[PDB]
Amino acid sequence: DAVFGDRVRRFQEFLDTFTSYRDSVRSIQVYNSNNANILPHRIIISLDDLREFDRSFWSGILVEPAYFIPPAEKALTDLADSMDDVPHPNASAVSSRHPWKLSFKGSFGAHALSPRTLTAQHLNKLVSVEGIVTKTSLVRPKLIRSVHYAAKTGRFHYRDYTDATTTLTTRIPTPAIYPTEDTEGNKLTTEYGYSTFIDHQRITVQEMPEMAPAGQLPRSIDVILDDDLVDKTKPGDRVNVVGVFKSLGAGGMNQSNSNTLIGFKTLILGNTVYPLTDFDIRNINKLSKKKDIFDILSQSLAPSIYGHDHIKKAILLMLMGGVEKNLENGSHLRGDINILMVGDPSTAKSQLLRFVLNTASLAIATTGGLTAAVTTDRETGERRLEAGAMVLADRGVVCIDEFDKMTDVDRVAIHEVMEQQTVTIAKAGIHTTLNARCSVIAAANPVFGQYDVNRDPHQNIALPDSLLSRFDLLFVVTDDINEIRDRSISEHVLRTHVTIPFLRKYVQYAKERVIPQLTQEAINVIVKNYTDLRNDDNTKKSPITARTLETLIRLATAHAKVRLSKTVNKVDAKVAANLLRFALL
Amino acid sequence: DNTEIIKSFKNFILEFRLDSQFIYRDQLRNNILVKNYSLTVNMEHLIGYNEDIYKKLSDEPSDIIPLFETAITQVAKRISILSRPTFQLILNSNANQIPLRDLDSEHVSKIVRLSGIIISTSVLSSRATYLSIMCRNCRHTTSITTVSLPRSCLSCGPDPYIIIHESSKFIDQQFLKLQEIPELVPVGEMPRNLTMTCDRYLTNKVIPGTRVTIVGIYSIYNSGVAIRTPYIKILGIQSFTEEEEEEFLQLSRNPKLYEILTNSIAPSIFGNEDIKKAIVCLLMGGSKKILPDGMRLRGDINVLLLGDPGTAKSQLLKFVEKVSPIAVYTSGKGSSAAGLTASVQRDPMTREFYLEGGAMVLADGGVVCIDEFDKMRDEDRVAIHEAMEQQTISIAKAGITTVLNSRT
Amino acid sequence: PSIQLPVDYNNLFNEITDFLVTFKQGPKYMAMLQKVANRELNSVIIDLDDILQYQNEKFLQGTQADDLVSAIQQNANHFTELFCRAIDNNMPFPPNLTRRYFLYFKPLSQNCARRYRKKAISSKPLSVRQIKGDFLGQLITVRGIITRVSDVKPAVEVIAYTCDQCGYEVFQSECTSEECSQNQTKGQLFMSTRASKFSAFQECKIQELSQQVPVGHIPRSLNIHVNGT
Numbered sequence A: 001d002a003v004f005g006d007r008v009r010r011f012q013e014f015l016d017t018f019t020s021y022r023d024s025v026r027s028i029q030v031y032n033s034n035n036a037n038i039l040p041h042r043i044i045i046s047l048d049d050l051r052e053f054d055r056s057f058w059s060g061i062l063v064e065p066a067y068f069i070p071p072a073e074k075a076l077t078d079l080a081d082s083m084d085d086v087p088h089p090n091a092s093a094v095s096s097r098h099p100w101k102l103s104f105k106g107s108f109g110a111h112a113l114s115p116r117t118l119t120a121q122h123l124n125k126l127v128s129v130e131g132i133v134t135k136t137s138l139v140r141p142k143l144i145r146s147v148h149y150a151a152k153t154g155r156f157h158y159r160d161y162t163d164a165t166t167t168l169t170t171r172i173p174t175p176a177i178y179p180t181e182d183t184e185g186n187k188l189t190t191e192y193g194y195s196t197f198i199d200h201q202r203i204t205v206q207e208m209p210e211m212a213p214a215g216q217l218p219r220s221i222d223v224i225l226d227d228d229l230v231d232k233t234k235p236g237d238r239v240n241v242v243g244v245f246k247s248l249g250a251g252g253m254n255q256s257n258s259n260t261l262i263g264f265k266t267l268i269l270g271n272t273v274y275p276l277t278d279f280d281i282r283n284i285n286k287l288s289k290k291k292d293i294f295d296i297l298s299q300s301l302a303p304s305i306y307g308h309d310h311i312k313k314a315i316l317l318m319l320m321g322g323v324e325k326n327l328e329n330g331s332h333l334r335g336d337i338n339i340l341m342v343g344d345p346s347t348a349k350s351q352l353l354r355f356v357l358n359t360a361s362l363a364i365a366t367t368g369g370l371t372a373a374v375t376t377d378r379e380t381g382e383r384r385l386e387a388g389a390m391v392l393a394d395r396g397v398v399c400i401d402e403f404d405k406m407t408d409v410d411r412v413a414i415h416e417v418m419e420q421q422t423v424t425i426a427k428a429g430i431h432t433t434l435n436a437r438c439s440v441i442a443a444a445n446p447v448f449g450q451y452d453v454n455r456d457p458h459q460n461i462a463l464p465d466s467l468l469s470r471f472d473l474l475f476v477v478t479d480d481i482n483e484i485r486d487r488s489i490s491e492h493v494l495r496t497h498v499t500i501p502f503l504r505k506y507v508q509y510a511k512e513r514v515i516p517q518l519t520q521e522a523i524n525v526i527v528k529n530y531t532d533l534r535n536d537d538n539t540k541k542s543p544i545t546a547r548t549l550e551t552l553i554r555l556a557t558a559h560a561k562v563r564l565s566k567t568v569n570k571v572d573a574k575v576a577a578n579l580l581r582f583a584l585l
Numbered sequence B: 001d002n003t004e005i006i007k008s009f010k011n012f013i014l015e016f017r018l019d020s021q022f023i024y025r026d027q028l029r030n031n032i033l034v035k036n037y038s039l040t041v042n043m044e045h046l047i048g049y050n051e052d053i054y055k056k057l058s059d060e061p062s063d064i065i066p067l068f069e070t071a072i073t074q075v076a077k078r079i080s081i082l083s084r085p086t087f088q089l090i091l092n093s094n095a096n097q098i099p100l101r102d103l104d105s106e107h108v109s110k111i112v113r114l115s116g117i118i119i120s121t122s123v124l125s126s127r128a129t130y131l132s133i134m135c136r137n138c139r140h141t142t143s144i145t146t147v148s149l150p151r152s153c154l155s156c157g158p159d160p161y162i163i164i165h166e167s168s169k170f171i172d173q174q175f176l177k178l179q180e181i182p183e184l185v186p187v188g189e190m191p192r193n194l195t196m197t198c199d200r201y202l203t204n205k206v207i208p209g210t211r212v213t214i215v216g217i218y219s220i221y222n223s224g225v226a227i228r229t230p231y232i233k234i235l236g237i238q239s240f241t242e243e244e245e246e247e248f249l250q251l252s253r254n255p256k257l258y259e260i261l262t263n264s265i266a267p268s269i270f271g272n273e274d275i276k277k278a279i280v281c282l283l284m285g286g287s288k289k290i291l292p293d294g295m296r297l298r299g300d301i302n303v304l305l306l307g308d309p310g311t312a313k314s315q316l317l318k319f320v321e322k323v324s325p326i327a328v329y330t331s332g333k334g335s336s337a338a339g340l341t342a343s344v345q346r347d348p349m350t351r352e353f354y355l356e357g358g359a360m361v362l363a364d365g366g367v368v369c370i371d372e373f374d375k376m377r378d379e380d381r382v383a384i385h386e387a388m389e390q391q392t393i394s395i396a397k398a399g400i401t402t403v404l405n406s407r408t
Numbered sequence C: 001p002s003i004q005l006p007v008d009y010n011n012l013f014n015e016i017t018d019f020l021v022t023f024k025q026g027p028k029y030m031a032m033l034q035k036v037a038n039r040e041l042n043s044v045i046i047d048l049d050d051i052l053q054y055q056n057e058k059f060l061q062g063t064q065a066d067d068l069v070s071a072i073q074q075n076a077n078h079f080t081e082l083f084c085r086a087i088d089n090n091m092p093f094p095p096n097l098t099r100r101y102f103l104y105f106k107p108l109s110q111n112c113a114r115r116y117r118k119k120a121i122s123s124k125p126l127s128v129r130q131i132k133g134d135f136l137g138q139l140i141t142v143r144g145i146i147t148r149v150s151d152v153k154p155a156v157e158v159i160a161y162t163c164d165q166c167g168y169e170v171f172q173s174e175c176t177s178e179e180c181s182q183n184q185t186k187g188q189l190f191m192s193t194r195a196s197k198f199s200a201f202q203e204c205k206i207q208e209l210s211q212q213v214p215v216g217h218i219p220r221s222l223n224i225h226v227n228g229t
Ligand SMILES: Nc1ncnc2c1ncn2[C@@H]1O[C@H](COP(=O)(O)OP(=O)(O)O)[C@@H](O)[C@H]1O
Pocket: B268, B269, B270, B271, B272, B308, B309, B310, B311, B312, B313, B314, B315
């Protein structure tokens, strides 16, 4: 109709009045011509610019996409096809026939929704949905335009097709298969090389648990993606997706089918996918030179816990971490540090773990699929692996609660994670190796509930010694009551009846830019302390092995990172030795 | 004829006055300003305003409630035009409620009032409310507002019309399961369940375990020779005498109230004063508090009787189950985690999977009595740990995960 | 609706005939067709390197030439039938229903393409993940590891019948021959299994190797169908 052409010309005027779009289109065209990889035929439209250009057209796109978006697509495709002559001898007949797709950015107005807030009132509108990608379907190509040759007539033919998903407006569907005869009735010669196909995939978006109330099942909605968006995401991705929420089929309206339970099927036609200072650095570097900066940073950690300075120091050093190395023989050296907590259950382990999980930027909570060696199947039957916490926490930290309750399979899997920082997957038809370079912090509790302070955790918790030896530091806490100190710490609870934003930047910068190496200063200290510990036959929390020396080196490197020094010094080794002696007592 | 009914509704909305104010007109105007297309009509005002339309509604509401919807929509649109979608009818009433067990084949299509506890709720479903259709043979278009598509064109062959999706409107609907209070169920009987349906603004207002008061229409639908499944069109959900208040205040004013109540707990048993007072404290229960971080302090008091056999320990629980207004009694041996706690089960009436509450979910806001607690399985105990300490139940079954609260 | 394309099958078929007649090893493919006519060989293999060499020879001689290799690569489904048609008329009931020989194309070699200053994108050993929808109907070379092979299965191309009323052989319940169409009485058809065109068929699946998989992904697979010799 004439309105379609009017809106096509209106979108052409929009494109011309802001040359910042069609100049990017020209740059894409030039880049594609130079490569005779190809950039996609997609541009992003600012919703505010469209609002300030034509309020009616922008409101139509938001509220009545079926009558406004296809004109805009036609206008953009015409502008792209008319801006150059396409002098390609053969590519002009195939590659130039792909329509151009639109994307939107800016303020969405009231169309900022979640899979729970998304309701039937929002149907037939362009809306933006925030959620998590639970799973993705299998990718298949889809026929768009068929080209064929009529040998008997000596000239070619073509045919187009429509589908309820790709067509925003309800055009007449075309269920016809690839034609064998044309209007002239002569048998057709198939031209696959000049036919057009577009890939397609379906994904499911579910509301984030961060806002989900209890007592109800989670809300999910399906999104359709095509062409360049077909394989851009993976399951478990936080995503902000803009698309047209559209219904399909019929809810028993045909024949009688008067069942009350039957409802109409709905989904979203996705078109845009958004997967989810120097002053501070200089202040960090200046603060690093103060003698008390380490203690200040330790006291900033865990403000809800009184005392436990050594545990806070260990947490800070573990966050700082060591330095990995590579050798000419192909060997690799572990740098990260692990911490284990033991003692009575409710005593301060939960609070410290909560602080660590909330403070760290890449902290993942675990408790008794962490092995990342299990497959999840799609609706069509095919299956894909799902990521595990030990693998996702690469270059991060793992927080474990009720570590004693984990299974033996988890233990035998985490042995390699803690030792070689890798995971060796060996299953029926699936074999792969994944990096697991993650720091581990865990809490465990005795069976009796009350820790026997006279004995090691090897009898209080009875975990395997090989598993325990993979933790660089161990701490035991138990509520040994001193009435005045308990009163002082519990007055804050009774009242209920360095800033963290800067500290996180401090840790980030220190781990990002500082890579300390060893120095002759620490060599003699390490050798002497290790020899003394070996010579010390008195009872200790754990025997002295080379893993203790590795822990000493890692702690020295972490302390150097706290000092942001690229070369270790004697003070780092002394602090590491003092901390290790404290942990062993 | 129905124009008189519409005019009467228009008067009852615009011109009815109570407390020297146009309460209905003002509340509808406030809803329009809030943009809530629903009107809460009180039946007690309707009976006092006009008895004939009340008789018609009570006897044959089948045409009255379409008239209600259209009249309210028209009046609200007039009010919006004066100040600057189909409005939903909501009914509030206080008349006597018929017992669920007394529902029969005589109350068909009659508006009734009920009370009970919600045990299961379904997911939302989208239902059509306004359609525009086109003939595939000749592209003739028309609009349609159980509904079925026309068999012949108005201008084409049988069933020529197809639905224009981008020019139609749809609404939400939810399916609910109601059952009578187990405290009102004599022993030897399973409480009767009842299917209820709500749409638009009445959806998602309740969760399993919620005790509600219902105003709705008793009706049946086809899903046994001729066993047609009954279902309720929800119209309104709500969830002591002055002399009783004075009597209980005097009871509170009694200088020996605590000892009187202590003796009142199982007077047919001797001694055991300490456990009697502890059970009294359990019956009253603690006070809820909320941390500034959003966590809730469990106010329930949980007591373990751990004495020698034959010390009236079972009799105390059996007496509390009589006394507590909300009480559930079950043996440890005859129960399971899927039965004590919530579970996901498929509803055969609507052919959909439903989240269904358990025994402890039913005891929300009350007391549960359990015996032979040492004889239940450890998984059940693990679930009971969550129920006791977090007042929540975590469900991970089939391919769905959810968390449901239980203040038991 | 009618459209126009620069492809001309008349020139391509004439070039195919000229290449068959002229390309020396006598001509190689003429010798192959002589061996087939001698009933020594069951299948014919077409080498795209020979076609490219002939095209380059025509280019250096200054004669007319069209990129026949690219045309075959783009629409191999029809060019296989074109080569079969050329052989059926140049080798020393509808013919296609009675043919029992097979034809296949072998890919270009990278050294040959680089030697003739051309890019052989189709023969590049790409993985199954990199095959987009644009390659549908195109002759491509895939590098991978086979993970599943099915045993030989029957695959009838044309089902044969015989009619008692007329005795004609019918190829695809009621006889469609001219004699029975003209006559009021029709002989019921029965499946002549021994006359049906059986073809040897196996189902094969190829999968990406470990070094081809992206980070954290699963190696994808593709279905390979093998027919004939
Ligand atoms: N102080 C008491 N006064 C009256 N009856 C008592 C008392 N103590 C026990 N009984 C009797 O004991 C019985 C309850 O025993 P019960 O607690 O059920 O046994 P068990 O502890 O094995 O469950 C009742 O019949 C009750 O009459």
